[PDB]
Amino acid sequence: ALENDSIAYFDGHKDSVFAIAQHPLYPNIVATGGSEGDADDAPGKGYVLDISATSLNPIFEIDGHTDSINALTFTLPRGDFLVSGGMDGRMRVYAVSVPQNGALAQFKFLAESQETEEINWFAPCPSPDHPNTIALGASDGSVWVFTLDNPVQIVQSYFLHTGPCTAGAWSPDGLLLATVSEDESLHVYDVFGVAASKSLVTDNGQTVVSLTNVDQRFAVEGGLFSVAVSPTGAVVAVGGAGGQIKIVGLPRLSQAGTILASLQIQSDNIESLAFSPSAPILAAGSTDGSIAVFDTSRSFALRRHLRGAHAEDPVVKVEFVKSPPNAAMAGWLLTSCGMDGVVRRWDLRGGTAGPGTLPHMAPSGLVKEWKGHRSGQEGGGVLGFVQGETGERIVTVGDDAVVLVFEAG
């Protein structure tokens, strides 16, 4: 008799659902992908759902993965493609057509490739200058940038990390790509060569910032697991073992590699980092169950330490609502999910603020929670979510092989 706040669900996955992606123009279109079983020959499987529809029927199926789907993304700016990335290293590219008569979206397979042996993440490039460009990071530490137009061309392939590449994030202008590794390194790639023409690259010609375990003010023993770039592109934050966060300077493209701040409020891996798009704050989710919030214009002074945000289960993902219905809350509303099987939303306006960081206004500031997934101890936990522009509909993917739809309103 678990509480269940879902307004819809999808139970077509046979095992853990690792990945979710939302169409950038049509938030009702969502793709989910994961594992079909734990037997070592179990294949991967993906679905596309239309959430405008209690038990959802998919409008498309992603087949061809011989191992778990680890990553999914629609391309920016308009979702012309859908890409899936597997534990098998397979990258499958689909053309996406969304008829203007309101009929079902169509998906056509274009090509499969296998540049790496295992894909850890995708990130679409936000540059308006380079549409339909995507980056991925792999288990061999390599980072690949592709452009889709054989629709696939290679923009770059990087081999600087020596251990698994755990996360990547683009700068807002989409000219820089920051990636981190278990081997404790951070590299920020000059993907389209702009920084090099301005004489802003390191001696390896490829990055604007390269920091490794030999850099003593930087090295995070145990590795890095998360990365985020500030809305101005001025700094990158990296999160790692033992609750450590490092703030590093980026060059202005329109100084670099300096450690501007080191943070260690939390006690275990920083798995998720997010800069607020419009408030001077940085949120960090930890494996220890807490979320911490820092004031970016006050040397990252601590604003609030939300202990037990997800009890003592890992905080898996934090993400700011881009355009909440209450415009006064823009930049201050945070959504999080955890291995406790719960999704939560937080009002971050409170805490210890200071000059320039006041709003024009179990832990505090909880606005709402959504239950339905099993908890981690019962084979559940929320592995990811999307929430569109307004945060009014939340779609989750769970370790318990379920996809749930929640509503905020």
Author numbering: 52 to 104, 127 to 222, 228 to 332, 366 to 472, 487 to 534
Task: Kindly provide excerpts from the paper associated with this entry.
In the case of Sqt1, we were able to decipher the mode of L10-N peptide binding by X-ray crystallography. These structural analyses showed that the C-terminal domain of Sqt1, which is preceded by a non-essential N-terminal extension of ∼50 amino acids, folds into an eight-bladed WD-repeat β-propeller. Moreover, the binding mode of the N-terminal residues of Rpl10 (L10-N) by the eight-bladed WD-repeat β-propeller of Sqt1, as revealed by X-ray crystallography, allows establishing a refined model for the final pre-60S maturation events that lead to the stable incorporation of Rpl10 and the release of Nmd3. Taken together, we propose that Sqt1 may protect Rpl10 from aggregation before and/or promote its incorporation into almost mature pre-60S subunits in the cytoplasm. We conclude that the β-propeller domains of Sqt1 and Rrb1, which harbour the essential function of these proteins, recognize the very N-terminal residues of Rpl10 and Rpl3.
To this end, we also performed in vitro binding assays with the orthologous proteins from the thermophilic, filamentous ascomycete Chaetomium thermophilum (ct), whose proteins often exhibit improved biochemical properties. Both ctSqt1 and ctSqt1.52C (deletion of amino acids 2–51), which fully complement the absence of Sqt1 in vivo, could be efficiently co-purified with ctRpl10 or its N-terminal 20 residues. As a first step towards the elucidation of the recognition mode of the N-terminal residues of Rpl10 by the predicted β-propeller domain of Sqt1 at the atomic level, we independently determined the crystal structure of ctSqt1 at 1.94 Å by molecular replacement and of ctSqt1.52C, lacking the dispensable N-terminal extension, at 1.5 Å resolution by single-anomalous dispersion (SAD) followed by molecular replacement using the ctSqt1.52C Se-Met structure as the search model. While the N-terminal extension could not be resolved, the crystal structures revealed that residues 52–533 of ctSqt1 form a typical eight-bladed WD-repeat β-propeller; thus, being composed of eight blades that each contain four β-strands and showing the characteristic ‘velcro' closure owing to the presence of the N-terminal β-strand as the outermost β-strand of the eighth blade. Sqt1 and ctSqt1 share a high degree of overall structural conservation and mainly differ in three ctSqt1-specific insertions located in the loops connecting β-strands 1c-1d, 5c-5d and 7c-7d. Analysis of the electrostatic properties revealed that both β-propeller structures notably contain a negatively charged top surface, whereas the bottom sides exhibit a charge-mixed surface.
